[PDB]
Amino acid sequence: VSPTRMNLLQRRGQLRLAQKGVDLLKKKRDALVAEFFGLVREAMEARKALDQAAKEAYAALLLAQAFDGPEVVAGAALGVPPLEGVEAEVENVWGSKVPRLKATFPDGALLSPVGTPAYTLEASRAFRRYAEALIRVANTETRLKKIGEEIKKTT
Amino acid sequence: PGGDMSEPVTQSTLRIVGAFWRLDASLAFRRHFPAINWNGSYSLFTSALDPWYRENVAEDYPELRDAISELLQREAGLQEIVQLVGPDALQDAERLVIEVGRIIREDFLQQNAYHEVDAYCSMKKAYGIMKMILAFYKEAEAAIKRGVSIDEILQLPVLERIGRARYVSEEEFPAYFEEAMKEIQGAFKALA
Amino acid sequence: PGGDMSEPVTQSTLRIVGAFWRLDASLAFRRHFPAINWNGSYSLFTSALDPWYRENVAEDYPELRDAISELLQREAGLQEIVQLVGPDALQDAERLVIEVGRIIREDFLQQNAYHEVDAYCSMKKAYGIMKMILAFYKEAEAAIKRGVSIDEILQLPVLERIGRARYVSEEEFPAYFEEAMKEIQGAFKALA
Amino acid sequence: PGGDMSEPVTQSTLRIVGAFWRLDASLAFRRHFPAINWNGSYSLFTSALDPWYRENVAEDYPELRDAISELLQREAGLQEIVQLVGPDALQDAERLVIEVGRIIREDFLQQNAYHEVDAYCSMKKAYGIMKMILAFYKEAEAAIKRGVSIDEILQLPVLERIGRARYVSEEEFPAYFEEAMKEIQGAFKALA
Amino acid sequence: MAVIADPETAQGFRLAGLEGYGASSAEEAQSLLETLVERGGYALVAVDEALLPDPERAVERLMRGRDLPVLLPIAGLKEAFQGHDVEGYMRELVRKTIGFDIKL
Amino acid sequence: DDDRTHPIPDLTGYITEGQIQLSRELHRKGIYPPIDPLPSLSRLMNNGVGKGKTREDHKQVSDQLYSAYANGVDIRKLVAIIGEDALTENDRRYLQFADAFERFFINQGQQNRSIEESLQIAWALLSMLPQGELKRISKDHIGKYYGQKLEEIWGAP
Amino acid sequence: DDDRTHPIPDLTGYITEGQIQLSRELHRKGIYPPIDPLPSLSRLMNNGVGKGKTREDHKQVSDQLYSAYANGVDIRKLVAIIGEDALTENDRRYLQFADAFERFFINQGQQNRSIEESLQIAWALLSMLPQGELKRISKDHIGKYYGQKLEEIWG
């Protein structure tokens, strides 16, 4: 940098631009924190709903395993077809792309049209609703993680 | 001496001339000519020549010139953020302004003094180029709000039609202009 | 010339003066007067003045002054918390010191020169106000380990006794001081 | 004056001298003596001394010197990345390059003028030290391809052998050199 | 999706069509988890919280450049019938994210 | 060279009582006169305003306009990064206030406006902001002047 | 002190008809000759080149090389802020073009290249860019010389 008056003015203009950029990035960090502090509340609500789902599904499975017998429960488990009906579509948030989990969850494709076992069918229903809540929990938590990473990158 | 514009002769000349055409070394390094610094240049004869321009060129020519100046000012405003967070952090409505400013800078302002055709340019040719650029910008601005991603727009073949209108001869320009204006509408209706 | 204390006159003055009352326009923007930056100011006469203070004002005056300065310092060390996380989300032990810092900034470090009695403040009055504020602070802290809602503490009527101690007259201050001394204890014993 | 390399005495000297040994205050602060800036220094006699080197120390000495210079250049290139992106963001090869550059900087370039042994270093001792460092680098870059983690390589006991090598006396160095030339291969052969 | 848990309740997960697995301890858990991260096709893996509280960092050496499979911990039998501090878990998320540990 | 530390601008500020600074960006946007209200200042303003002369609501209106324009200017820069949809309602109203302010108040052209017309336009611009956010103005003047629409100058800019 | 604004180089540039400026950065990387192309200039270049003198595509190739090298050097400054992994696909082409240009066109050693070989190398370097981005070259020369791969010369 050769010392001239024009270069001095150019340096002072750069200092002004740097200060204004610092303030603008501070405002962006404020907005990101504002989004994060609500996303965490939604995630907490989803987790505490998933806990109740776990309670009732585990109660149903535990009661069905003893009364009916593990043999018929296993037979129903082989009877039920496996499902891979999840499509990882990608959601755009804050200039970055995150995966969003969408579940197909078809009805009527499963076996046992009527409940020939006494309690296994209810346990299957409870665990299916468990999966339906678990996908929501994962969906909110991944967005929380990405927003946190953006906050760290800005700071 | 050394490009220092605070020289006594440079400062004395600044206080008596009516127009000031400042040149930049950074533009001459990358072979961008005439290398006029848009930010540091000015002219005081702009407001007095409007009655001549309206009668001899077109009725809306000063409005087009002011719109071009406003676009250049807006592009100059956004460049402080591009240096700070990169070009990709901008929204598509601002990326459109950046790309239109780049198109204006590389097409309208740039001129080759040694080329066989581009060395001389009449006022009506420049008016046609300005009209084409503003029509493209308006169509692109309308397309963004409809839902088209900007990466679709800046690959249309009409960009090469615009970008090579410099080398069209003076006698052949009216047909090229009327073809390009129809091509703009033909291209921008098929996006979404 | 521009707020830069690097000019020759300011260094030449700083080398010999015994006190330095740095003003700031930021506190004037908030209409907080006197607008004195208490973080950049200093004084070199404190060490030689306390044999006068603890003989003509009160025996506990110097230690009370250092306690008040420590309380002011602790509020300034939490700014990088509040500028990132919202002020209301903080813990009780930090919200308490933030509120006591606000109380200091608004009820002790603020003065009205156009008021009838607030324009001039004596040492006994200032000592009484500082004792009043520390009596509030210690009992609020002790209530915090006792375990209560912090919002109830911020609502208690002794806040009015804190604020209205400025505008009491000089000759009738001690009765007000004794009343507030019994009142803060009575109010915090009434709290659960 | 003040470390300014643009003053006339330095500039008049640089136009006639054949070698330029630039010192740095940053290296002197951290006690990294002789504190020669290996990026700003140069020598114009390197090409004319190679026939003497090929006869008096080894035929492969210039190649080893060029390899060490290339490693230092790569290390300097990565030092701009590590400081503001984070050392963990680098891949295994880049972390290995950084660690080998640190080993070169601390074990070979550094020399203590007051130690009873390190004050003087012969040519063959330095040649053996470069052979040790480059043999270690080759073995490490070969072992990284086998999936070994980098921090397991930094815990290898053979690192201390290279570190203490410059303190070995001139007469005892050839015996130490062969033991190092066996241990370097042995440790990396037994390493996963 | 895939889910590893206690061997008592993997039958509940295959009862809903999920690819449930049973794990007895931490070493079986991390080996099996590495097996689910090496092959492709599945987009979500669930791990018992009492078995492996950090399902992603235990394998982070393998997806330093991809994040398609979501790795997430869930409550097991020991937490389901008596409850556990999900508020403490979320305070821990705030711990790793902001770094200040402030909330009321 | 636009250097405010140059001796001629430096010594003039030591003898004079404020300054009015023209802006090049406002001139390039086509606004005339290009008077930028942020760095401009009049030091004897408080002695020539208040009841007994001009109008009694002058000072508070000027302060409110200054603060609102200062907010809108930085909201306008924040928009370019975070997008318009990420803002709250108040930030969008501040942005629109800044745009309408630059469009109507500063850009008067060759009009000869009296003080009453300027105050009317100022109160019309403040009406776009919601009531209660006008912190610097007392309720007495707000209950007297707030509420007029912009149509007087909006119909003929 | 490598200062271009020193009075002696300043007046020499004002008097002479161009200059050849060496670069210390290219010297540190081992490139010989270390000629910096951007600050260099030749005023009488237009008189001695063109059709019937050297070849018909000389000037346009020179202009395109200048523009592409300037773009690559500009991208090198963006990489220092956002990191090279966050670049678009287009900018990586310019970055690799700049690196290959510095490593092959400038660096030649003591060999004596003819004008035809230099133009062949220049056309091989321009072929790494998309055909639609050669704005300064007429389509007649593009249809005649484009498409040649750099490995055909050094392999």
Side-chain angles (χ1 to χ4, degrees), chain G residues 52 142 144:
Chain G
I142 295 173
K144 193 174 174 72

Side-chain angles (χ1 to χ4, degrees), chain A residues 5-77:
Chain A
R5 198 77 67 176
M6 215 180 39
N7 264 34
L8 174 62
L9 300 176
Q10 186 305 152
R11 294 285 89 185
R12 296 210 282 213
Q14 225 75 51
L15 183 63
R16 269 217 342 277
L17 297 189
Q19 261 150 33
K20 266 147 76 181
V22 160
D23 221 315
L24 197 96
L25 288 173
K26 223 166 283 322
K27 197 150 321 292
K28 193 200 172 191
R29 179 165 55 70
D30 161 24
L32 284 176
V33 168
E35 171 148 21
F36 185 77
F37 267 24
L39 195 51
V40 65
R41 205 169 321 293
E42 308 310 309
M44 221 162 45
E45 180 195 297
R47 182 68 69 157
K48 72 176 56 184
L50 179 72
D51 231 322
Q52 190 313 327
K55 177 180 297 184
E56 73 175 46
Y58 272 129
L61 183 270
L62 185 61
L63 209 149
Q65 153 268 288
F67 269 44
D68 199 292
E71 188 23 82
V72 152
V73 172

Side-chain angles (χ1 to χ4, degrees), chain F residues 70-128:
Chain F
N71 287 354
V73 152
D74 64 48
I75 292 332
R76 197 154 60 187
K77 232 184 307 302
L78 172 67
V79 164
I81 289 188
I82 75 172
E84 172 265 5
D85 287 321
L87 291 185
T88 74
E89 184 60 37
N90 273 241
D91 293 13
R92 288 192 292 265
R93 258 185 281 90
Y94 276 121
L95 178 73
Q96 268 152 270
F97 171 83
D99 298 6
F101 181 85
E102 286 175 3
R103 211 136 68 72
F104 295 119
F105 203 71
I106 307 184
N107 189 35
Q108 82 180 72
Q110 292 287 335
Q111 295 168 19
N112 190 0
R113 291 178 179 172
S114 62
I115 179 63
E116 301 102 313
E117 288 159 293
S118 301
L119 283 166
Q120 177 163 47
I121 297 166
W123 267 115
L125 288 179
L126 286 179
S127 301
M128 290 177 12

Side-chain angles (χ1 to χ4, degrees), chain C residues 40-169:
Chain C
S41 304
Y42 68 87
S43 170
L44 307 176
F45 294 111
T46 49
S47 57
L49 257 49
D50 35 41
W52 187 94
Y53 279 132
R54 63 169 66 260
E55 275 49 66
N56 304 357
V57 184
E59 196 73 80
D60 45 345
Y61 186 83
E63 278 71 38
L64 184 70
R65 178 196 65 218
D66 319 292
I68 273 280
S69 266
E70 200 32 62
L71 276 181
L72 276 165
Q73 183 286 30
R74 281 166 69 198
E75 194 273 347
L78 295 192
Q79 295 310 299
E80 70 313 349
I81 280 85
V82 193
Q83 301 316 74
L84 168 93
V85 180
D88 65 0
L90 267 46
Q91 303 302 137
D92 311 340
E94 276 49 44
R95 238 175 136 174
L96 188 276
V97 312
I98 289 292
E99 290 301 321
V100 86
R102 186 186 59 77
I103 288 165
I104 292 304
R105 279 155 46 215
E106 295 190 316
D107 296 310
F108 185 76
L109 297 184
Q110 195 175 336
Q111 199 159 1
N112 189 359
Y114 307 130
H115 201 271
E116 286 87 357
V117 293
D118 197 30
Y120 165 77
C121 191
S122 78
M123 290 300 90
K124 301 183 79 173
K125 176 171 170 178
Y127 154 80
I129 297 162
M130 269 183 333
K131 281 288 281 275
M132 264 195 24
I133 291 171
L134 266 275
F136 174 80
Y137 163 74
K138 288 209 76 25
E139 298 292 339
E141 188 167 4
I144 274 298
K145 280 65 54 188
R146 191 203 300 174
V148 295
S149 181
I150 184 158
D151 288 339
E152 178 64 26
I153 294 181
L154 310 210
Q155 188 52 36
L156 286 172
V158 300
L159 191 140
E160 179 80 353
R161 280 284 202 174
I162 280 311
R164 287 334 81 204
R166 282 165 51 187
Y167 298 139
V168 70
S169 186

Side-chain angles (χ1 to χ4, degrees), chain A residues 2-4, chain G residues 3-5:
Chain A
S2 316
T4 62
Chain G
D3 195 8
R4 187 175 167 113
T5 71

Side-chain angles (χ1 to χ4, degrees), chain D residues 45-47 49-50 53-54 60-72 123 127 130 134:
Chain D
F45 301 112
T46 311
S47 62
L49 297 182
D50 284 346
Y53 289 135
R54 291 192 190 277
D60 63 336
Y61 173 87
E63 333 299 325
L64 278 179
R65 179 189 66 216
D66 294 358
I68 281 193
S69 308
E70 165 264 9
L71 273 168
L72 283 167
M123 264 307 203
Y127 174 72
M130 331 198 276
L134 285 179

